[PDB]
Design an enzyme around this catalytic site. Sequence first.
Site, mmCIF file in Angstrom:
data_model
loop_
_atom_site.group_PDB
_atom_site.id
_atom_site.type_symbol
_atom_site.label_atom_id
_atom_site.label_comp_id
_atom_site.label_asym_id
_atom_site.label_seq_id
_atom_site.Cartn_x
_atom_site.Cartn_y
_atom_site.Cartn_z
ATOM 1 N N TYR A 19 0.801 -1.261 0.000
ATOM 2 C CA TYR A 19 0.000 0.000 0.000
ATOM 3 C C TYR A 19 0.825 1.299 0.000
ATOM 4 O O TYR A 19 0.584 2.185 -0.849
ATOM 5 C CB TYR A 19 -1.120 -0.011 1.067
ATOM 6 C CG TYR A 19 -2.270 -0.918 0.634
ATOM 7 C CD1 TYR A 19 -2.213 -2.306 0.830
ATOM 8 C CD2 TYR A 19 -3.371 -0.405 -0.050
ATOM 9 C CE1 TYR A 19 -3.212 -3.133 0.405
ATOM 10 C CE2 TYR A 19 -4.393 -1.237 -0.467
ATOM 11 C CZ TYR A 19 -4.305 -2.603 -0.233
ATOM 12 O OH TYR A 19 -5.313 -3.445 -0.693
ATOM 13 N N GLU B 177 -8.965 -7.466 3.258
ATOM 14 C CA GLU B 177 -8.054 -8.460 2.698
ATOM 15 C C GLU B 177 -7.468 -9.337 3.830
ATOM 16 O O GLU B 177 -7.453 -10.550 3.732
ATOM 17 C CB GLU B 177 -6.968 -7.758 1.884
ATOM 18 C CG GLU B 177 -7.471 -7.271 0.511
ATOM 19 C CD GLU B 177 -6.867 -5.937 0.035
ATOM 20 O OE1 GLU B 177 -5.787 -5.517 0.512
ATOM 21 O OE2 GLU B 177 -7.493 -5.288 -0.832
HETATM 22 C C1 HEM Z 1 -6.152 2.216 -2.020
HETATM 23 C C2 HEM Z 1 -5.375 1.347 -2.678
HETATM 24 C C3 HEM Z 1 -5.961 0.516 -3.858
HETATM 25 C C4 HEM Z 1 -7.123 0.678 -4.507
HETATM 26 C C5 HEM Z 1 -8.268 1.669 -4.277
HETATM 27 C C6 HEM Z 1 -7.177 -0.319 -5.535
HETATM 28 C C7 HEM Z 1 -8.252 -0.491 -6.368
HETATM 29 C C8 HEM Z 1 -8.255 -1.451 -7.326
HETATM 30 C C9 HEM Z 1 -9.282 -1.685 -8.318
HETATM 31 C C10 HEM Z 1 -10.551 -0.846 -8.443
HETATM 32 C C11 HEM Z 1 -8.895 -2.721 -9.065
HETATM 33 C C12 HEM Z 1 -9.612 -3.394 -10.252
HETATM 34 C C13 HEM Z 1 -10.418 -4.509 -9.578
HETATM 35 C C14 HEM Z 1 -10.828 -5.646 -10.490
HETATM 36 O O1 HEM Z 1 -10.141 -5.910 -11.528
HETATM 37 O O2 HEM Z 1 -11.853 -6.299 -10.132
HETATM 38 C C15 HEM Z 1 -7.626 -3.166 -8.536
HETATM 39 C C16 HEM Z 1 -6.916 -4.199 -9.054
HETATM 40 C C17 HEM Z 1 -5.619 -4.526 -8.783
HETATM 41 N N1 HEM Z 1 -4.804 -4.058 -7.734
HETATM 42 FE FE1 HEM Z 1 -5.451 -2.583 -6.578
HETATM 43 N N2 HEM Z 1 -6.033 -1.082 -5.498
HETATM 44 C C18 HEM Z 1 -5.262 -0.558 -4.502
HETATM 45 C C19 HEM Z 1 -4.039 -0.998 -4.095
HETATM 46 C C20 HEM Z 1 -3.295 -2.004 -4.620
HETATM 47 C C21 HEM Z 1 -2.036 -2.450 -4.069
HETATM 48 C C22 HEM Z 1 -1.422 -1.835 -2.812
HETATM 49 C C23 HEM Z 1 -1.578 -3.432 -4.846
HETATM 50 C C24 HEM Z 1 -0.263 -4.210 -4.658
HETATM 51 C C25 HEM Z 1 0.467 -4.706 -5.666
HETATM 52 C C26 HEM Z 1 -2.562 -3.597 -5.913
HETATM 53 C C27 HEM Z 1 -2.547 -4.473 -6.953
HETATM 54 C C28 HEM Z 1 -3.594 -4.675 -7.818
HETATM 55 C C29 HEM Z 1 -3.558 -5.600 -8.932
HETATM 56 C C30 HEM Z 1 -2.398 -6.466 -9.416
HETATM 57 C C31 HEM Z 1 -4.911 -5.476 -9.606
HETATM 58 C C32 HEM Z 1 -5.424 -6.238 -10.847
HETATM 59 C C33 HEM Z 1 -5.262 -5.329 -12.062
HETATM 60 C C34 HEM Z 1 -4.516 -6.105 -13.113
HETATM 61 O O3 HEM Z 1 -5.183 -6.922 -13.804
HETATM 62 O O4 HEM Z 1 -3.272 -5.916 -13.253
HETATM 63 N N3 HEM Z 1 -3.579 -2.733 -5.746
HETATM 64 N N4 HEM Z 1 -7.263 -2.359 -7.481
#
Ligand code: HEM
Length: 403
Positions: A95, A137
């Site tokens: 994060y 999570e």
């Molecule tokens: C406030 C912090 C975060 C928010 C609001 C956020 C929000 C989101 C959203 C809306 C999605 C798309 C969800 C879906 O595909 O159903 C997503 C996907 C994802 N998040 Fe986050 N996320 C956050 C932090 C993080 C962190 C800290 C990581 C660490 C590596 C991360 C890694 C990913 C990955 C790998 C995806 C899938 C997108 C892809 O296909 O590459 N995210 N997140």
Amino acid sequence: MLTQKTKDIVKATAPVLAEHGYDIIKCFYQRMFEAHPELKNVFNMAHQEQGQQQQALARAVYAYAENIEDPNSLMAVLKNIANKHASLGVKPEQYPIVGEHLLAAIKEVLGNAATDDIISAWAQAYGNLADVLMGMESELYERSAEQPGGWKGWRTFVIREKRPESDVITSFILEPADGGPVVNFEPGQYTSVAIDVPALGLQQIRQYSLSDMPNGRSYRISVKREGGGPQPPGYVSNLLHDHVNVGDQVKLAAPYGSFHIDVDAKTPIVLISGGVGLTPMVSMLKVALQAPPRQVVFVHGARNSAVHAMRDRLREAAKTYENLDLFVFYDQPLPEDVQGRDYDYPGLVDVKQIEKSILLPDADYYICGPIPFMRMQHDALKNLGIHEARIHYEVFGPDLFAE
Ligand code: HEM
Ligand SMILES: Cc1cc2nc3c(=O)[nH]c(=O)nc-3n(C[C@H](O)[C@H](O)[C@H](O)COP(=O)(O)OP(=O)(O)OC[C@H]3O[C@@H](n4cnc5c(N)ncnc54)[C@H](O)[C@@H]3O)c2cc1C
Ligand SMILES: Clc1ccc(CO[C@@H](Cn2ccnc2)c2ccc(Cl)cc2Cl)cc1
């Protein structure tokens, strides 16, 4: 926690962020991967190379700003994100990393427009959301860990069976290399396959619906080859098709996702799927079919017989079970495909054509398939007067789409 003033800045500035989404996304990833190359094993490196995310991002900031005064609506989509992050193995310690680069990106792209007030407001919104997500999570990680057959992170599985289901969809039956039980899940849930991609010199991760019923021993995924025709081939799906075999090993995440049947419910289910979108429907079918009655309507659209997965098995199911109605639509039937015999209706799934068969009282409707297919089904269901609360959907991609 956000002051009224902070939320107002978010509401006033979301359009600016959505408008500069492309450049931000591009800058964010350039910055993050330079600082932390190892994160390339967790993100999708196709992403085309970022287009789909810009769409997602634009919708997501708007919806956030549009619902910042309504914590309940916000908690619901946060749950879908937590589930997706849990599946990917997202860690609390990541994060601060995302946060810095996101903010550094937003700041560099907005340049002069990135006032202190504005940067402060989105930074607080990043932190507020980070907190909620980490807590959700974590709670999901502990629940998997504690259950019979559960685990945290990746577990090694071996392919026991690999069977073609049609020209394009192949099933993989998976047992843990450790030989122990596997955790229960809700029909409709998914695992994540983590596997090394030689062409990339990187691990890649992809979600796949668990396409069979819980049995306590093994899991089934059913994978559509995302192939050629001017568009570049998919990485992982081609890799499973051509290079993964009986006796090879992959890593899996524990089951996650918020799209599923209530198993304990006795009210009816209408299962509406397009193409590979059938995979989580099959699991729901097979579970619901035991226990009085329960009543399943299985509505499937496919191109034709060549690309129709599990065709002989559903047909046999529809003649063995009184509580199952089968409706098959073929969009472009082959010459050997005959209507009233090999399929029920031509064209796209159209619920008006089977209206009295699907409008069971106080039912639950479940929809899975390509986005315009889902809009179309959603819309049609909503024109019959089914409540928004009774329609459930899962996207085989980011989003947040048919919200
Ligand atoms: C406030 C912090 C975060 C928010 C609001 C956020 C929000 C989101 C959203 C809306 C999605 C798309 C969800 C879906 O595909 O159903 C997503 C996907 C994802 N998040 Fe986050 N996320 C956050 C932090 C993080 C962190 C800290 C990581 C660490 C590596 C991360 C890694 C990913 C990955 C790998 C995806 C899938 C997108 C892809 O296909 O590459 N995210 N997140
Ligand atoms: C919750 C969930 C459940 C899912 N369940 C299933 C399931 O049961 N069965 C199943 O088969 N899939 C399922 N998927 C989809 C799956 O997770 C992968 O997205 C899919 O298998 C494709 O992955 P890939 O590595 O083969 O393609 P990627 O390498 O990730 O590429 C993605 C797509 O974009 C195209 N593409 C790549 N590069 C470009 C380019 N530069 N220009 C234009 N287009 C390009 C590719 O051809 C491919 O179609 C699910 C997804 C989710 C989110
Ligand atoms: Cl300018 C901006 C404002 C807010 C966010 C908010 O979330 C970002 C960061 N991120 C990435 C993965 N997990 C989180 C994001 C979310 C979802 C998708 Cl599909 C892409 C992105 Cl970049 C991102 C860019």
